[PDB]
Amino acid sequence: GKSHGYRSRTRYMFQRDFRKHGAVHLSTYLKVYKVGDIVDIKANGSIQKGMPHKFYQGKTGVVYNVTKSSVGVIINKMVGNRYLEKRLNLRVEHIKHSKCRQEFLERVKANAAKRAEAKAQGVAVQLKRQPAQPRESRIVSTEGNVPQTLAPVPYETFI
Amino acid sequence: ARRPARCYRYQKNKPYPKSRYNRAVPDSKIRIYDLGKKKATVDEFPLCVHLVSNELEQLSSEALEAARICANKYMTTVSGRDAFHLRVRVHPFHVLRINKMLSCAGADRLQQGMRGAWGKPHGLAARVDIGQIIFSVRTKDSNKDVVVEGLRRARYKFPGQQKIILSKKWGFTNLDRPEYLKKREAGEVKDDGAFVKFLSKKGSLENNIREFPEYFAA
Amino acid sequence: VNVPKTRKTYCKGKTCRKHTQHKVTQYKAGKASLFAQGKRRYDRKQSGFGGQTKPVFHKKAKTTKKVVLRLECVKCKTRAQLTLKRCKHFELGGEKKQKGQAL
Amino acid sequence: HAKVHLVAIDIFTGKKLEDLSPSTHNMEVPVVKRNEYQLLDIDDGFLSLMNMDGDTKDDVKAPEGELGDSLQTAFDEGKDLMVTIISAMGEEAAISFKEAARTD
Amino acid sequence: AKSKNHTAHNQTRKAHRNGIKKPKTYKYPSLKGVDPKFRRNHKHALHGTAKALAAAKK
RNA sequence: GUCGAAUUUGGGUAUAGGGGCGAAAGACUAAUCGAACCAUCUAGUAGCUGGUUCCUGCCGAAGUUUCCCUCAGGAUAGCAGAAGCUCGUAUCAGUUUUAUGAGGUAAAGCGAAUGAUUAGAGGUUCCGGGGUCGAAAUGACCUUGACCUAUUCUCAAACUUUAAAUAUGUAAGAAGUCCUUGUUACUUAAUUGAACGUGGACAUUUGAAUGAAGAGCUUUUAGUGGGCCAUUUUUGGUAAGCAGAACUGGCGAUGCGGGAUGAACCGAACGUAGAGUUAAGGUGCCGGAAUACACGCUCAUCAGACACCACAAAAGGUGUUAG
RNA sequence: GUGAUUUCUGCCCAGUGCUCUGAAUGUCAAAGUGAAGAAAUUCAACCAAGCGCGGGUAAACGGCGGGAGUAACUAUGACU
RNA sequence: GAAGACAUUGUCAGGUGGGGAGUUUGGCUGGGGCGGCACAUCUGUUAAACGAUAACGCAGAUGUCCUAAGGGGGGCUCAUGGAGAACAGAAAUCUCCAGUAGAACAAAAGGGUAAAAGCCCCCUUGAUUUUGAUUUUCAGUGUGAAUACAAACCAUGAAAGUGUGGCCUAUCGAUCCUUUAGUCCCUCGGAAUUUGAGGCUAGAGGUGCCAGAAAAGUUACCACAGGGAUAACUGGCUUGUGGCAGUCAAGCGUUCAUAGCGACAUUGCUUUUUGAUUCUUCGAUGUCGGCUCUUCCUAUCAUACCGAAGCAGAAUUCGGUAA
RNA sequence: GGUUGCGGCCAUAUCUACCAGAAAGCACCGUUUCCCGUCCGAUCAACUGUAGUUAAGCUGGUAAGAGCCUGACCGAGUAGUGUAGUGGGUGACCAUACGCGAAACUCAGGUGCUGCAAUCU
Ligand SMILES: [Mg+2]
Ligand SMILES: [Mg+2]
Ligand SMILES: [Mg+2]
Ligand SMILES: [Mg+2]
Ligand SMILES: [Mg+2]
Ligand SMILES: [Mg+2]
Ligand SMILES: [Mg+2]
Ligand SMILES: [Mg+2]
Ligand SMILES: [Mg+2]
Ligand SMILES: [Mg+2]
Ligand SMILES: [Mg+2]
Ligand SMILES: [Mg+2]
Ligand SMILES: [Mg+2]
Ligand SMILES: [Mg+2]
Ligand SMILES: [Mg+2]
Ligand SMILES: [Mg+2]
Ligand SMILES: [Mg+2]
Ligand SMILES: [Mg+2]
Ligand SMILES: [Mg+2]
Ligand SMILES: [Mg+2]
Ligand SMILES: [Mg+2]
Ligand SMILES: [Mg+2]
Ligand SMILES: [Mg+2]
Ligand SMILES: [Mg+2]
Ligand SMILES: [Mg+2]
Ligand SMILES: [Mg+2]
Ligand SMILES: [Mg+2]
Ligand SMILES: [Mg+2]
Ligand SMILES: [Mg+2]
Ligand SMILES: [Mg+2]
Ligand SMILES: [Mg+2]
Ligand SMILES: [Mg+2]
Ligand SMILES: [Mg+2]
Ligand SMILES: [Mg+2]
Ligand SMILES: [Mg+2]
Ligand SMILES: [Mg+2]
Ligand SMILES: [Mg+2]
Ligand SMILES: [Mg+2]
Ligand SMILES: [Mg+2]
Ligand SMILES: [Mg+2]
Ligand SMILES: [Mg+2]
Ligand SMILES: [Mg+2]
Ligand SMILES: [Mg+2]
Ligand SMILES: [Mg+2]
Ligand SMILES: [Mg+2]
Ligand SMILES: [Mg+2]
Ligand SMILES: [Mg+2]
Ligand SMILES: [Mg+2]
Ligand SMILES: [Mg+2]
Ligand SMILES: [Mg+2]
Ligand SMILES: [Zn+2]
Questions:
Q1: Anything further noted (chain C)?
Q2: With touching defined as 3+ CB pairs under 8 A, do chains A and E touch?
Q3: B178 three-class SS
Q4: A/B touch flag: 3 or more CB pairs below 8 Å
Q5: Is the CB of E27 under 7 A from strand F?
Q6: A63 neighbors A73 (Cβ within 8 angstroms)
Q7: Which residues does residue B36 pair with via DSSP β-bridges, in sequence order?
Q8: From CA A24, how far away is CA A95, in angstroms rounded?
Q9: B50: which of A100, B186, D27, E43 lies 20 to 30 Å off by Cα?
């Protein structure tokens, strides 16, 4: 009859890539993970040990534990009408920093430096970002760029 | 014996082709797909016409058989067997399922209803789109009138509306008349037994040299 | 299956506390004795009229039984046991399997 | 409903037995096996057999069946006695006698 | 006498009637499941810190 | 039908209920019989049908998850009320933006893997089947087939290089950042690290948008666990006002204007009244509202007249009209 | 059980029953017997009927099959 | 007279005992039954590119097997093809070249694997112990399976490491009772010793209807509660099947398509066949057929009037207006 | 810049056929008493650096080279798709409004970069 195994309906989700089978380049293990890092989860079909269940594919969480060769992660899963926090244990292969924070800290440090240098002359640093403002008035000249006139096209079968 | 065609006029189910999973199908009625002087060169038949679809349907292999037979036989009887090259451009690859049920009087004692009503293969069909070619014919310009009439007489076997169009291409190539003509008067066109190969700008130079010699012999 | 007649394993014998040698024997039930609380209560209830009074089992479905080994430390002389998955055939005395031979 | 009435003959005793069951009762199905043993010199009423490898089975005791008598008769001139053994639930006896006198 | 077997109809509405609120957050989250070897150190570490501060502020 | 006998019949007497009696029908036993009548245990048990008696006000549902000899029933979770409690603009939001992830559907491809598929073209047999020349030859000619090479026509839910839109994860700060130096039995070749701290520095532009009707928390319990319809995606079937799913909105529980008529369609949701303007729909008359204005088409010896909606096709016509 | 008379009531005892065997390496309860133990108790050997095994029984319940070749036209099949 | 410590009688024990008593005789389901298991599970697809998602949907599989097919280490590289070597040939063994896996990895399929996860060799038992934490099904219970540490004892390798069964996704089991191992621990309640018994921790004995009752039929002599949640009539939707009608033209028709026919196709119509579903009725709509009686429909058998013919007349055929 | 050892990124780095390569380095290259492994000092082991050769490996270049990578108003704002209507059509299906937006194809360009340490006319 029906069937729901541990790895059901993952046939494409866990395929490795095109032209990328084989061992893994060492940079992944040369990474270093601190408690509190925000990390994305992408399964790697080559290492059956310590895989994440398909539901946690492509999700993002916060590390909370570190062991000899694996990592503890916290995820929020929507079950019923609430969220429950699940704790996972994953080998370092299905793991990679979400560079969202990598860039965000860049913004923060640049922000602080900007604030300080602006305060060096007291000039209202104006920190917050803005969405795309509507563009401004402007003049367009036609020198060597005389307007060119179009017209709709008649019809033919083109075969 | 054969269920009327109106029961399979539309595309109602996903394509269901014969494969290692089907393993029990009949054979399509259509076996010959290119007719006429098929060994003709490319260059002796410039004119080309198409029988194009203006619908979204399924065509029974039997219908293809009837149309092919009628069109071919007419084209032969009038214009001589070697004045055209006719070709079908579809293939029945979609299997059609049927739920065979007892048809005796008093079968109420045996029929079992739709309880377990998976079908059984009994006929093939081909799926066709708006703007897809069905029949393609190439011949000399002197026979446009006869060939177009043959195709018109052929449309009557197909369900739905189909147009007849005169392609502005040379033969079955992907080129229009003047472009092919200039390219052929230049050396970069070498015919093959049925189709034609084209000298390219890419490739290993001496290999291009060994063929198309007169093109380099400028 | 085939299982060696000897095996070296951790032995919690209050003297061993380290892997020691161990003979192996297959678990056997042991004779069901009277005077046990269950049996004697059951006899009391079965007495008198009423006929059968406790359920009797009919719908046997499994064909095999988990096999259980009986380990003893050759030094400390204490008995430990452990289990194996189901198997229709079991065998301790084993002619060790070979590869090169033909049919 | 639908029930089953069946008659089956005993494997070893040869007696005739029969019963009927509703078509849901699953009475036990015995497990048997044919082994293709070889017969050595016929000793006293026992039988003396041969594995493909071993010298075992001083068991089933030279079947008294009339085909057993025919086997005993055909034995004394030899010609490569082949036999089979049925061993349903331990109680076992030889059922079939056969010959491959090739040794070539 | 069949019976309609399964569906998720109206489940989304029935849920969103009350929020899908984020679970919660806190300082000092639970330490259950963390590396016990690390926990054993950390406990004595805090112990030593607290003793040092008490003796200093004394 | 039978009428001299296995005949008909009065009175007495015998047989009492799981018992009697039966020339045999499951018949008879006080109109009661495939288990008589009377009382009591007894208001017997019921997952099943029927009813359930005053007014107003406020809030307001489910026909779904899991387990059950469970399928007309329960438990559990979900949906609801009530009681409140701790605080007072927030650790919020069925939303967008910015930044950063994950995916193998639509589409597309087969002169790219797998599988299918039409046609010629060029080679290749110490090697296929042959025929012709030959006694044969690793001798020649034709033929069929194979095999290889470059092309060509067409496909896939259990194929795929590529790869959408819509849906979806995380972050956008004080629980932060920086600086200095304390603790440890952990770890490091090592005061190196790790983790938590001491102390100091940085505020309303404190780190996008918009809103916030307050925010958060706890109990406890009713009803519910037969659903149905519509657009869109979609499975079996020829189909169905059929059966089965996905997302959303409805109907049930709901009236009001319109579709004549109707649970679902269109508008729009309702305390009680007055005035004004509109929706969807209409403006010959029934009927409130222009026999308004304007450019064209059509004459039917079964015209045509409005979505869901209450049906018509392939094929034809010097009917007519414009191309 | 069958149903005047007349005329006949064929074959099968493998199965199920009934009956009759019990010389017997079959099986067995309670009582009793022997051994071990301080005792509770344990373990042995022994056993009636019955059953097992072996005959009779169909006016007892009942049952009473297939496949091939064959004769001078063919055909069939006395026959094997 | 007969019989005699035997009969008989009393109490236990085994046997026989539908004559009699009590009781049961699963669920799913396009009515129910027969059928099958969708009744616990696993692979791929249906599944609509997160997740979840039904059908007696599609293609399949499990109730096992393995002291190695586990663990570690080391060496090597496969399927296939070409070219050569006595017997030897399409196939034996040897050698070289090509070889991204086209092979193998217990088994179904799908992933994954090349100085390996494949093949061969060496050493071993981590298929061990102590209890926790976490993931999947989910109520965030259990069972199953799996993951990451901790504390010992180990194996392997020079070593870093690796190892808590099978490369990953399936291969399995509560309370009571019996039994085994551990502690040699607690208790037998007037106090002692020794048997015996009862307890704590951890396994085994099976519940496949697989979150787990112990269970054979018949009712046409039947009974009760109910059901239109569900069958047999009519009625409504659908038209496969049944019946009826066109479009096309290869041929038939001595010649010639249509005088009349008409293959291979294809578009419809009808509800007088039979299916298909289950909307209404199971507190009852009297269910075959015949008899009598009225009206209606047209797809016309005859009658009226016409047209056409392979229509001399005669006769006949086709067609139109027509109920 | 060349070369070597250890690498990162993993083809712009692979493959096919040719041509060149100072110095050093790498390499092929000589031998079998010992540790050691083989059917066989071929691989692996050990010793010499002496007897020789850049022939090969390796590096670099060459090809209207295959492949591979990048880009483009080339294809195409097409295919596809979110949202709307009492829009069209008997229907199959199709336009229209506000939005997002492919692949193939064509053309053009490119054919390894780089870290640590040592050594080199
Ligand atoms: Mg992927
Ligand atoms: Mg008593
Ligand atoms: Mg008793
Ligand atoms: Mg179901
Ligand atoms: Mg009767
Ligand atoms: Mg009476
Ligand atoms: Mg009452
Ligand atoms: Mg149950
Ligand atoms: Mg209910
Ligand atoms: Mg009810
Ligand atoms: Mg409940
Ligand atoms: Mg409830
Ligand atoms: Mg998919
Ligand atoms: Mg597609
Ligand atoms: Mg494509
Ligand atoms: Mg393919
Ligand atoms: Mg997103
Ligand atoms: Mg209540
Ligand atoms: Mg329900
Ligand atoms: Mg209701
Ligand atoms: Mg409403
Ligand atoms: Mg008003
Ligand atoms: Mg008026
Ligand atoms: Mg016209
Ligand atoms: Mg006794
Ligand atoms: Mg006896
Ligand atoms: Mg009874
Ligand atoms: Mg049922
Ligand atoms: Mg999904
Ligand atoms: Mg293995
Ligand atoms: Mg290895
Ligand atoms: Mg669990
Ligand atoms: Mg370890
Ligand atoms: Mg594993
Ligand atoms: Mg158990
Ligand atoms: Mg016990
Ligand atoms: Mg169960
Ligand atoms: Mg009964
Ligand atoms: Mg009945
Ligand atoms: Mg109904
Ligand atoms: Mg019916
Ligand atoms: Mg029909
Ligand atoms: Mg029909
Ligand atoms: Mg009718
Ligand atoms: Mg009905
Ligand atoms: Mg009724
Ligand atoms: Mg009534
Ligand atoms: Mg009536
Ligand atoms: Mg008419
Ligand atoms: Mg709307
Ligand atoms: Zn020990």
A1: Present with 13600 molecules/cell in log phase SD medium. There are 2 genes for eL42 in yeast.
A2: yes
A3: helix
A4: yes
A5: yes
A6: yes
A7: B85
A8: 13
A9: B186
Which residue is it, tokens 């029949």?
Answer: B135
CB–CB contacts below 8 A, A to E:
29
* Block residue for tokens 């069109």: B71
Run of H or E residues at A105: helix A99-119
CA of C13 to C1' of H182 (A): 10
A9-18, long-range: CB < 8 A, 24+ apart: A9/A54, A10/A54, A13/A43, A13/A54, A13/A57, A14/A43, A14/A45, A14/A54, A15/A45, A16/A44, A16/A45, A16/A46
Helix axes B61-79, B144-155, angle to 10 degrees: 150
| CA B69 to mean position of chain CA atoms | 13
Under a CB-based contact definition with an 8 Å cutoff, are residues B30 and B65 in contact?
yes
Going by their DSSP bridges, the two strands C18-26 and C6-11 should be labelled as: antiparallel
The closest nt to C31, taking CA to C1', is H179
A92 neighbors E38 (Cβ within 8 angstroms): no
Q: Is A78 on the interface with B (CB under 8 A)?
A: no
Structure tokens at C4: 């060696």
User: Under 8 Å CB-to-CB from B68, ≥6 apart: which residues?
Assistant: B30, B32, B35, B88
Q: Which ligand is nearest to the CA of E1?
A: 28
| Residue B143 near residue B76 (C-beta atoms within 8 A) | no
Technique of determination: cryo-EM
Three-class DSSP category at A119: helix
E4 touches strand F (CB under 7 A): yes
Q: How far is CA D90 from CA A148, B118, B181, D12, E37, in A?
A: 104, 49, 93, 12, 59
For A148 and F139, how far is CA from C1' in angstroms?
79
Rounded to whole angstroms, the Cα distance separating B103 from B52 reads 40
Residue appearing with tokens 């008659």:
D7
Residues making up chain E, counted from first to last: 58
Per DSSP, B142 falls in state: G
This PDB structure is determined at a resolution in Å of: 3.6
Tokens of D40: 């050595």
Q: Is B42 helix (H, G, I), strand (E, B) or coil?
A: coil
Residue with tokens 């430096």: A113
Q: Does B167 touch chain A (CB under 8 A)?
A: yes
Among the partner residues A64, A65, A81, nearest to E20 by beta-carbon distance: A81
E23 to chain A, minimum CA–CA distance in Å? 5
A84/E23 Cβ within 8 A? yes
Strand I nucleotides within 7 Å of a protein CB: 7-11, 63-66, 91-94, 107-108
CA distance D69 to D73: 6
C-alpha of C32 from chain center: 15
| Tokens 């729901």 sit on residue | A4
Q: Which residue is nearest to nucleotide F119 (CA to C1')?
A: B34
Which residues are within 8 A (CB) of B218 and not within 5 positions of it... i.e. 6 or more apart?
none
Query: Which long-range contacts does B177-186 make (Cβ < 8 Å, 24+ apart)?
Result: B177/B46, B184/B43, B186/B215
